[PDB]
Amino acid sequence: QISDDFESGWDQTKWPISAPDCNQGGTVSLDTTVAHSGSNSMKVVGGPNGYCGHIFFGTTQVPTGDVYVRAWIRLQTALGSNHVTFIIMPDTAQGGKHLRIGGQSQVLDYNRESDDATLPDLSPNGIASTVTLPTGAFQCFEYHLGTDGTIETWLNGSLIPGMTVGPGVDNPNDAGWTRASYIPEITGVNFGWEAYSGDVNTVWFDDISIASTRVGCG
Ligand SMILES: [Ca+2]
């Protein structure tokens, strides 16, 4: 459980840098000119050096059991076709490999590092069932990881059907995700930018809350 409006700045021990394996060219900084709440947010700029250009800040202060994450997110450039990532969660259910939230085929999705599965399937109907991340303004992004396989995702309070799965929940485009039984067991949440293609973008994060209960959009 952890929250931050960044109005007291960037506490670097609360929100350390993460750049697994390699670190070349990405930046994390407090921005005092772009924000959702108040004056400040966290600005992440991916470096132009493929995967190694990645960078994140994050925390291991995550509850066990149900987890709700909420962040206000501003994206500079529209999501393209390439596979990109802006949230990584080390996952015990994948032996430490990452549950990722990002973009592919111009829309938001989940991705498992272990087997490269996506939620939704990136079929035409799957793509239609998820959404783009609008640019140039802070968006309220929230998700819930349950204990029974449930995953729920909201943008500006509206459920994203393609990015929602779980016991008895009818998602017609969840085949890749549910091939094997998968229940997340995350140990951290990291916010930033990563792209194997070397796609560069700038993403700002403000008003982060991680909790055992639904946060909402204020
Ligand atoms: Ca703020």
Short mmCIF file of C-alpha atoms and ligand atoms in Angstrom, two decimals:
data_model
loop_
_atom_site.label_atom_id
_atom_site.label_comp_id
_atom_site.label_asym_id
_atom_site.label_seq_id
_atom_site.Cartn_x
_atom_site.Cartn_y
_atom_site.Cartn_z
CA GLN A 1 0.00 0.00 0.00
CA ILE A 2 1.50 3.29 -1.14
CA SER A 3 0.32 6.63 -2.56
CA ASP A 4 1.91 9.78 -3.92
CA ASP A 5 0.70 13.07 -5.44
CA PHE A 6 4.38 14.12 -5.95
CA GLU A 7 3.61 17.43 -4.33
CA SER A 8 6.52 16.96 -1.91
CA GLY A 9 8.78 16.00 -4.82
CA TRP A 10 10.45 12.76 -5.85
CA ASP A 11 11.51 10.65 -2.87
CA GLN A 12 14.19 8.51 -4.51
CA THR A 13 14.17 5.82 -1.83
CA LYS A 14 10.36 5.49 -1.96
CA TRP A 15 10.48 5.46 -5.77
CA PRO A 16 13.84 4.05 -6.89
CA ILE A 17 14.90 3.72 -10.52
CA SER A 18 14.60 0.30 -12.13
CA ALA A 19 16.23 -0.61 -15.45
CA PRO A 20 16.62 -4.41 -15.58
CA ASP A 21 19.73 -5.86 -17.31
CA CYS A 22 20.90 -2.65 -19.02
CA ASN A 23 20.49 1.12 -18.73
CA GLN A 24 21.36 3.44 -21.60
CA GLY A 25 19.73 6.79 -22.26
CA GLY A 26 16.38 6.76 -20.45
CA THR A 27 15.52 9.42 -17.88
CA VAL A 28 13.27 9.77 -14.86
CA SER A 29 12.70 13.21 -13.31
CA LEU A 30 10.25 15.31 -11.36
CA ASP A 31 8.42 17.64 -13.71
CA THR A 32 7.24 20.90 -12.13
CA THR A 33 5.54 22.11 -15.35
CA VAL A 34 3.17 19.19 -16.14
CA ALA A 35 0.86 17.60 -13.57
CA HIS A 36 -2.55 16.28 -12.75
CA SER A 37 -2.62 17.22 -9.05
CA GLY A 38 -0.92 20.48 -8.12
CA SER A 39 2.41 21.37 -9.63
CA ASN A 40 4.39 18.15 -10.06
CA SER A 41 4.36 14.72 -11.72
CA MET A 42 7.00 12.12 -12.61
CA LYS A 43 8.33 12.32 -16.19
CA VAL A 44 9.83 9.28 -17.89
CA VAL A 45 11.60 9.54 -21.26
CA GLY A 46 12.70 6.33 -22.99
CA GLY A 47 16.20 6.36 -24.53
CA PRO A 48 16.64 5.74 -28.29
CA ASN A 49 18.66 2.54 -27.75
CA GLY A 50 16.11 -0.28 -28.11
CA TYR A 51 15.36 -2.31 -24.96
CA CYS A 52 18.35 -0.82 -23.11
CA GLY A 53 16.82 2.66 -23.52
CA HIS A 54 14.18 1.57 -21.00
CA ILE A 55 13.70 3.04 -17.57
CA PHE A 56 11.19 2.88 -14.69
CA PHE A 57 10.62 4.04 -11.15
CA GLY A 58 8.70 1.83 -8.78
CA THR A 59 7.99 0.13 -5.50
CA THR A 60 7.72 -3.21 -3.80
CA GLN A 61 5.16 -1.83 -1.29
CA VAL A 62 2.38 -4.00 -2.73
CA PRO A 63 -0.20 -5.84 -0.66
CA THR A 64 -0.62 -9.61 -0.89
CA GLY A 65 -4.01 -10.73 -2.17
CA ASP A 66 -6.23 -8.30 -4.10
CA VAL A 67 -4.38 -5.34 -5.51
CA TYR A 68 -5.75 -2.15 -7.00
CA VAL A 69 -3.47 0.26 -8.83
CA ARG A 70 -4.48 3.74 -9.96
CA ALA A 71 -2.32 6.23 -11.82
CA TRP A 72 -3.04 9.39 -13.73
CA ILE A 73 -1.04 8.99 -16.93
CA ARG A 74 -0.17 11.46 -19.69
CA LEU A 75 1.27 10.12 -22.93
CA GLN A 76 3.15 12.40 -25.35
CA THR A 77 2.97 10.52 -28.69
CA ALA A 78 0.19 8.15 -29.84
CA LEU A 79 0.70 4.39 -29.42
CA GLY A 80 1.92 2.79 -32.65
CA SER A 81 1.80 -0.78 -33.92
CA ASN A 82 4.94 -1.97 -32.09
CA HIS A 83 4.94 -3.71 -28.74
CA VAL A 84 5.70 -1.15 -26.01
CA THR A 85 5.44 -1.29 -22.21
CA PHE A 86 4.76 1.40 -19.59
CA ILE A 87 4.09 -0.67 -16.43
CA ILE A 88 6.07 -3.75 -15.32
CA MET A 89 5.22 -5.99 -12.37
CA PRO A 90 7.62 -8.73 -11.25
CA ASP A 91 5.37 -11.74 -10.87
CA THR A 92 5.84 -14.80 -8.59
CA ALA A 93 3.35 -16.64 -10.86
CA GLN A 94 5.96 -16.29 -13.64
CA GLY A 95 8.94 -17.08 -11.38
CA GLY A 96 9.95 -13.40 -11.19
CA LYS A 97 9.31 -12.55 -14.87
CA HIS A 98 7.08 -9.56 -15.61
CA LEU A 99 3.37 -8.98 -16.01
CA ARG A 100 3.37 -5.96 -18.33
CA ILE A 101 0.86 -3.32 -19.33
CA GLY A 102 1.56 -1.58 -22.60
CA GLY A 103 0.50 -1.02 -26.17
CA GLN A 104 0.50 -3.08 -29.35
CA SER A 105 -1.43 -2.63 -32.59
CA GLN A 106 -2.26 0.92 -31.42
CA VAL A 107 -4.23 -0.23 -28.35
CA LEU A 108 -3.74 -1.03 -24.67
CA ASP A 109 -3.14 -4.59 -23.49
CA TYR A 110 -1.58 -6.87 -20.87
CA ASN A 111 1.37 -9.03 -21.79
CA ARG A 112 3.07 -11.89 -19.95
CA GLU A 113 6.85 -12.03 -20.33
CA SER A 114 6.92 -15.81 -19.67
CA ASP A 115 4.82 -16.98 -22.65
CA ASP A 116 4.24 -13.70 -24.57
CA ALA A 117 0.45 -14.05 -24.08
CA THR A 118 -1.64 -10.86 -24.47
CA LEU A 119 -4.99 -9.74 -23.08
CA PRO A 120 -6.99 -9.29 -25.23
CA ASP A 121 -6.02 -11.45 -28.19
CA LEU A 122 -4.88 -9.05 -30.91
CA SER A 123 -7.49 -10.26 -33.41
CA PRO A 124 -9.74 -7.66 -35.03
CA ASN A 125 -12.48 -8.28 -32.43
CA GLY A 126 -9.90 -8.27 -29.63
CA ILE A 127 -8.46 -4.93 -30.77
CA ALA A 128 -12.02 -3.51 -30.95
CA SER A 129 -12.66 -4.65 -27.35
CA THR A 130 -9.78 -2.66 -25.91
CA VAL A 131 -8.96 1.05 -26.30
CA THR A 132 -6.25 3.52 -27.23
CA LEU A 133 -4.56 5.65 -24.62
CA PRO A 134 -5.42 9.29 -25.48
CA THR A 135 -2.45 11.67 -25.62
CA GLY A 136 -1.70 15.15 -24.36
CA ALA A 137 -3.70 15.05 -21.11
CA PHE A 138 -3.72 13.04 -17.91
CA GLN A 139 -5.98 9.97 -18.08
CA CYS A 140 -7.15 8.01 -15.04
CA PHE A 141 -5.90 4.45 -15.43
CA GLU A 142 -6.83 1.79 -12.92
CA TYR A 143 -6.56 -1.96 -12.65
CA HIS A 144 -7.39 -4.74 -10.24
CA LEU A 145 -5.53 -8.04 -9.88
CA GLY A 146 -7.65 -10.54 -7.95
CA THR A 147 -6.87 -13.84 -6.27
CA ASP A 148 -8.97 -16.13 -8.50
CA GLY A 149 -7.78 -15.10 -11.99
CA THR A 150 -9.82 -11.88 -12.06
CA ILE A 151 -8.22 -8.92 -13.80
CA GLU A 152 -10.19 -5.72 -14.28
CA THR A 153 -9.10 -2.53 -16.07
CA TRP A 154 -10.72 0.93 -16.23
CA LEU A 155 -9.88 4.11 -18.13
CA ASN A 156 -11.56 7.31 -16.86
CA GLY A 157 -13.84 5.03 -14.79
CA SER A 158 -15.08 2.96 -17.75
CA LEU A 159 -14.36 -0.76 -17.81
CA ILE A 160 -12.12 -1.87 -20.69
CA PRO A 161 -13.85 -5.16 -21.66
CA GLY A 162 -10.91 -6.58 -23.63
CA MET A 163 -8.59 -6.09 -20.65
CA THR A 164 -11.01 -7.73 -18.21
CA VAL A 165 -10.98 -11.48 -17.48
CA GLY A 166 -11.94 -13.88 -14.70
CA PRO A 167 -14.04 -16.80 -13.45
CA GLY A 168 -17.38 -16.81 -15.29
CA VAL A 169 -16.55 -13.46 -16.98
CA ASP A 170 -17.38 -13.59 -20.68
CA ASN A 171 -14.38 -12.27 -22.65
CA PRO A 172 -14.60 -13.80 -26.18
CA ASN A 173 -11.06 -12.62 -26.94
CA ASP A 174 -9.15 -14.14 -24.00
CA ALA A 175 -7.89 -17.37 -25.61
CA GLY A 176 -4.13 -16.70 -25.38
CA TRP A 177 -4.46 -15.49 -21.81
CA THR A 178 -6.49 -18.45 -20.50
CA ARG A 179 -4.68 -21.28 -22.34
CA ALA A 180 -3.06 -22.16 -19.03
CA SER A 181 -4.42 -21.28 -15.60
CA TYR A 182 -2.90 -17.92 -14.65
CA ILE A 183 -3.33 -15.96 -11.44
CA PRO A 184 -1.01 -12.99 -10.94
CA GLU A 185 1.05 -12.83 -7.76
CA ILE A 186 2.93 -9.57 -8.16
CA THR A 187 5.72 -8.34 -5.89
CA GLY A 188 6.20 -4.81 -7.26
CA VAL A 189 4.85 -2.13 -9.59
CA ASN A 190 7.09 -0.04 -11.88
CA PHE A 191 6.08 2.87 -14.12
CA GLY A 192 8.09 4.01 -17.14
CA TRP A 193 8.85 3.11 -20.75
CA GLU A 194 10.33 0.05 -22.53
CA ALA A 195 10.36 -0.83 -26.22
CA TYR A 196 12.41 -3.52 -27.97
CA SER A 197 11.90 -1.67 -31.30
CA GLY A 198 13.51 1.43 -29.76
CA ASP A 199 10.23 3.41 -29.97
CA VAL A 200 10.70 6.55 -27.92
CA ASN A 201 8.01 8.29 -25.95
CA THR A 202 7.54 10.46 -22.92
CA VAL A 203 5.10 9.42 -20.23
CA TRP A 204 4.10 11.30 -17.09
CA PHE A 205 2.65 9.67 -13.98
CA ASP A 206 0.88 11.47 -11.15
CA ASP A 207 -1.39 10.55 -8.25
CA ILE A 208 -0.36 6.95 -7.92
CA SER A 209 -2.22 4.79 -5.43
CA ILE A 210 -1.71 1.11 -4.75
CA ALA A 211 -4.23 -0.40 -2.34
CA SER A 212 -6.13 -3.51 -1.28
CA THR A 213 -9.39 -1.78 -2.29
CA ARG A 214 -10.68 0.20 -5.32
CA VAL A 215 -9.13 3.67 -5.57
CA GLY A 216 -11.33 5.43 -8.18
CA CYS A 217 -10.86 8.67 -10.16
CA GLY A 218 -11.52 11.20 -7.36
CA CA B 1 0.92 16.00 -8.63
#
